[PDB]
Paper text:
(f) Ribbon representation of PC39-50L with 4aa CDRH1 insertion. However, we were able to fully resolve the CDRH3 of another 4aa-insertion mAb 50L and show that CDRH1 participates in stacking interactions to stabilize the CDRH3 despite the shorter insertion length. Intriguingly, the 4aa-insertion Fab 50L differs substantially in structure from 11aa-insertion Fabs as well as from other V3-glycan Fabs due to a slightly more elongated conformation of its CDRH3. However, in both 4 and 11 amino acid cases, the acquisition of a triad of tryptophan residues from CDRH1 and CDRH3 is observed, but it is not yet clear what the functional and evolutionary consequences are of this particular feature.
Author numbering:
A (entry chain H): 1 to 31, 31A, 31B, 31C, 31D, 32 to 82, 82A, 82B, ...
B (entry chain L): 2 to 27, 27A, 28 to 95, 95A, 96 to 214
Amino acid sequence: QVQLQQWGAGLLNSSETLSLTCAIYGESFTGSWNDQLWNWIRQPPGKGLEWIGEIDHSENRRYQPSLKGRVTISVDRSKNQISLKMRAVSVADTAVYYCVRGRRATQWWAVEPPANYGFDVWGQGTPVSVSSASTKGPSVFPLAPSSKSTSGGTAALGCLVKDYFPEPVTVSWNSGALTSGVHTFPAVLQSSGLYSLSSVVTVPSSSLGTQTYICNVNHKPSNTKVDKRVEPKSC
Amino acid sequence: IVLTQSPGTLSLSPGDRATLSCRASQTIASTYVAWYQQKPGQAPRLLLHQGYNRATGVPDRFSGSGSGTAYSLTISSLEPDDFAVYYCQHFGTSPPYSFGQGTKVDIKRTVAAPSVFIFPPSDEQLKSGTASVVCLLNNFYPREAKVQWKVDNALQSGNSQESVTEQDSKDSTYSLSSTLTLSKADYEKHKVYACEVTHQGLSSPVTKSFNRGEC
Ligand SMILES: *[C@@H]1O[C@H](CO)[C@@H](O)[C@H](O)[C@H]1NC(C)=O
């Protein structure tokens, strides 16, 4: 049962040094047939998989050339732990960083191993967010319904959960009593490094004068709880 | 070595045959082609290694085929748990390793045109020196949608961000949220803020707009 557990600080300022650690369980650094390949693969928000670096059974290291020399991968053989260090982090380096086990047969007298030339075991990953912001509760602004947000008999309204850090926030409507037609979107990483998402709900236009609408926002990293009444704008 | 996957999105139902393509810029040996499955909120899962060998626990329906430049992940017939993103990878004799952009297999349904809504910046946000304008596309299918921000006489670029929900569990539709963010000083320079939406379900691009200051 090969297992990879990851830890390390995922919240860093600009230009700081990322430091992640991966502990190997169920397997040796080299493997039984000197075929183990220990890789770091990241996935920026919304994009695909980007390879970063590798250390093999011989402790040879090969890195992604696009990262220049900012990446260093080492191993503590006494602990069976691999470390990833990325220097001078940018907002572009914000991603989920996976510790991955690969395999490539190297001994000619050996049988072809399972998952040869394949990343068969992946760690759960460590989310990394580069930003200059500290832990900040969001500002909950109303997305007020009006004659510019009505399709047929249906009005749309919501809340903008803006300028918080880090992830995540939770949004509910009327203390969870309103769920039908609700859409809470995944946050986007602003240029400033803060986060921002929108939670909306479609309702009958006539209910704007007979039903109150409140978005319940909860940002546990900052212990910020905001209840925002969203009222229709008349004009 | 660049891997290009196609199509960008595959809309199928259970029982249909999925054929995902992976094309390399150069000729690669089958031993170096891997395929992965990834679902939202989960690490990727190895499906095929060395071009055609199924990884441990991969069901029979997942098969691989091809040689030279064209390789394929073929699901005989989709099961309900096969809707995910699939990546192909070049796992060569030495790094670097490159992945394709991916192919998303979603649930097929009838075309649903989005409902478009536009939200002005709230007075609370303007008092802090920032103006966010939100455009909402509600419960549409397929996922392909074009959202263009126009402020007065200028199409906007580099000042908005998009966010799409997963395919709904009830009606299998998508929803999108686009946020145009401007400084308060720039926001008050213009009047007409418009959101143009192109989708397969709309006979023509639907534009939702408002006039700043006006009503
Ligand atoms: C960035 O630096 C400031 C000042 O040192 C600090 O308050 C803030 O928490 C830092 N941000 C992160 C994400 O560590």
